[PDB]
């Protein structure tokens, strides 16, 4: 059903079982998250994960580099699903094959159970976010953070370049001067809206994304294209990218 895309658990079961084109794209994301947090020096005390949705794959390597992680989403349902796993409930999603993959990428310094435990311990707060708001976390009493991570969670809320830029500028209020912004996102994306019977598209390319980051008050440390074009019946892009930036 297309309605499955409105259900956080159906979404997990459709794509993340890791047992496919999507699995190969996920390995590209995981290799680059490991590179960012564990080879390229993005480390510190406090990391805020924006638009976490119901997934934890984006935090597995990050929890080696940050003592505290705040996860957030605009949807209560996403966060309910995520909390099933954080609280170790039996009906939670089985992330074990993914966790095992990341432990192997990290050279098996930790085994899966110890990695899951380190992540659950690091997650200190589960909060609503809204990148469209000048105070995206609603002014919760968090001190300025060392990193904000935004993985594949902006295009639904930011339908065009100016709104994308403004969301990045709003996220900057969460970071200390010099604090890292890590974006992962899709170049020239489109997603088929079954209800409205049209694609909705966000034309991100390197030059436009770099400009949006720099006008949102960051300096770019590194941009990289990390996968080739992908096409399913319901989405397209011309590859995924990651970008590491520092707040002014």
């Amino acid at each position: 059903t297309y309605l499955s895309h409105f259900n956080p658990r159906d979404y997990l079961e459709k794509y993340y079982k890791f047992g496919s084109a999507e699995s190969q794209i996920l390995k590209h994301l995981l290799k680059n998250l490991f590179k960012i947090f564990c080879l390229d020096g993005v480390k510190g005390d406090l990391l805020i994960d924006i638009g976490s949705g119901p997934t934890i794959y984006q935090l597995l390597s990050a929890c080696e580099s940050f003592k505290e992680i705040v996860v957030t989403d605009y949807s209560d349902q996403n966060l309910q699903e995520l909390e099933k796993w954080l609280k170790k409930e039996p009906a939670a999603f089985d992330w074990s094959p993914v966790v095992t993959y990341v432990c192997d990428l990290e050279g098996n310094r930790v085994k899966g159970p110890e990695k899951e435990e380190k992540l659950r311990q690091a997650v200190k707060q589960v909060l609503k976010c809204d990148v469209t708001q000048s105070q995206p976390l609603g002014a919760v009493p968090l001190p300025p953070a060392d990193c904000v991570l935004s993985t594949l969670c902006l295009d639904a809320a930011c339908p065009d370049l100016p709104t994308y830029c403004r969301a990045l500028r709003n996220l900057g209020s969460l970071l200390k001067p010099g604090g890292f912004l890590v974006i992962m996102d899709a170049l020239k994306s489109s997603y088929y809206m079954i209800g409205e019977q049209k694609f909705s598209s966000l034309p991100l390319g390197r030059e436009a994304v770099e400009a949006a980051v720099k006008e949102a008050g960051y300096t770019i440390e590194w941009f990289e294209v990390i996968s080739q074009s992908y096409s399913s019946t319901m989405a397209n892009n011309e590859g995924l990218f990651s970008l590491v930036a520092r707040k002014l």
Binding site: Y2, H5, F6, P8, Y11, K14, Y15, E22, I25, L29, I50, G51, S52, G53, P54, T55, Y57, Q58, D73, Y74, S75, N78, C129, D130, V131, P136, S150, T151, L152, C153, L154, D155, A156, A157, C158, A167, A186, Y191, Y192, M193, I194, Y230, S232, M234, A235, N237, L240
Partner: peptide, 11 residues
């Protein structure tokens, strides 16, 4: 929503 891969979450 809709969460259609590679979309992961809702900022």
């Amino acid at each position: 929503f809709p969460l259609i891969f590679p979309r992961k979450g809702c900022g």
